[PDB]
């Protein structure tokens, strides 16, 4: 179920924060692992002051993730995927909970590089853990990081992803809410 | 009206908690009795520490029940029947109010058995009261319980259902909100 | 604007509470006067312990009125016009704010009589002020009240309605929110 | 991003409050600058007691702006663009946060004049800063103000707009929430 998945992801992230001195987590992609990482990020922000930013492919994906986060927090979802509504929801989520949800076209390497570069300008590269939310995101993220010369960051992204993938396969976040 | 129906169901459940040493209530099905049982379960969780889980047939039914529970609690409904939104809403409802809403295909005996077996793994069989929300759910639930050897549980499910059915016929939960 | 309309209706209702010893207000109908009366009823419940029940024609009308009340109170609207969602929202509104929104087919005299008779069973006839929300509701309500022998109640309904109609014509509740 | 845009607009408005003794801000138009000005107005109301009213072209635009404001404040959006729902949301926003969102057809000079004249009746002309949200709104607002003899107000509207336009071009309120 969802709690077991969030707990397992939280434990993995705690191990990485201690291992790498992480101050900021950037999640690239959508789906169940993106939600689980965002929810673990809510706990990590409250308990450790570590901020999390999720980069999703389009405004529709941002609305879907913000709506699931809203439900988890007991808060209203944004009324629509209007950019102004999404930006306002994002600013509120950041101020109150240390989480962001931003739009970046992951099919476009230049757009993903630009979104990462914005986050690196805000949060730096040394203390930032970048994680893909799935296989497709890993395949998009690795070459971009490698082009930027961030080989260690790419290596950690792949290794931590493998552990998260295995943990979520066992935890089954959504098992109770579909056939 | 709704308050009279919740009160009547609450009184019946209190009698069963004392009679059987009940720690967990599992409601199988949808409709007015499912809502009334869930609402009585909110009171029982607050007052007695007894948790309630409702098993509904599909994601659409989970959204409809979560939305009615939300309205009763003064909380936002989940934005959609997206599995991630439903799972997040369920985790929040459990943590704050001691209630869950899960999806289990009741037309499929193996799926209902699997969902009950998950709950029995979490909560045990001895202290768990299983109740159908209607005739169709009773007809689905009885053979599954009997196959599991849970004859007493099936007997209580049918007997308590009969009393709840009669009480709700008199109380008329929805009389003021349809023609 | 809306505040001026609520204030004017509130002042009129205060005068009637003192004049008739009113404990319960029943509003029959939909539209701007129904909303203004419901909002004044929120204030009267908080300040005076007087409860208000609005009888609207169908579930769609109940959702629209509950949604406007929700917006005025800073609360989530019910997710849909599902009867269970409307009944749950109504129970929450009553418990927290002393207001109800019920469905009664005003085109059907027997249905309106039945809905009034339910309220009279709950709240009595002597201390109950019944008000139409518009001309059509007044035309439906007067014969029903007269058949019940409630001639004084019908007379007050018409007289107080006339004063509310004039006050709302001057106050223009919705002037700032349509062309 | 949005926070940088709100901060930049806030700083400009603070300078104008000191420069002109402003008690009320009226924003004419829709779009990103309308949202940013409304959000800066939330801060100015809390910190300085300065109220802000946004005049938008139609009910659909009022819903979109109220929904984005709701998301920024962690509050439910109005269920629909129903005039009663919009008026109720507006009254709540004014009472709690010192902001209004009203409908005025800016394509119709008489309608814009009427909406401004209502605000001038409520708030006066001397202490009221009127700002367009974009080029089209400036082109609609200038002749109306000039016809009213409010030449200085029109001059300030154009000058402050130019500074806000430049600031928002640099701040990029919506950059993280569209492609």
Rg of chain A: 15 Å
Mind telling me the CATH class of chain A? Answer: Alpha Beta
Q: How many beta strands in the DSSP annotation of chain A? A: 4
> Strand order, biggest sheet of chain A?
3-2-1-4
For the largest interface, the chains and their residue counts are: A-B, 26 and 28 residues
The span between the termini of chain A is 14 Å
The 3D shape of chain A can be described as globular
Number of domains of chain A: 1
What portion of residues of chain A is helical?
55-70%
Protein model, in words:
Four copies of one chain form a homotetramer. Chain A is α/β, with parallel strands linked by helices and 179 residues long. The first copy, chain A, has seven helices and four strands, in the order H-E-H-E-H-H-E-H-E-H-H. Chain A has helices at 2-20, 32-48, 59-73, 83-97, 109-123, 135-147, 151-171; strands at residues 24-28, 51-56, 99-103, 128-132. In chain A, helix 2 (32-48) links the parallel strand 1 (24-28) and strand 2 (51-56). The longest helix of chain A has 21 residues, at 151-171. The radius of gyration of chain A is 15 Å and the shape is globular. The A-D interface holds A 58-59, 62, 75-76, 78-80, 82-92, 94, 96, 100, 102-103, 105, 111, 115, 118 and D 1-3, 32, 35, 39, 63-65, 67-77, 173-174, 176-179.
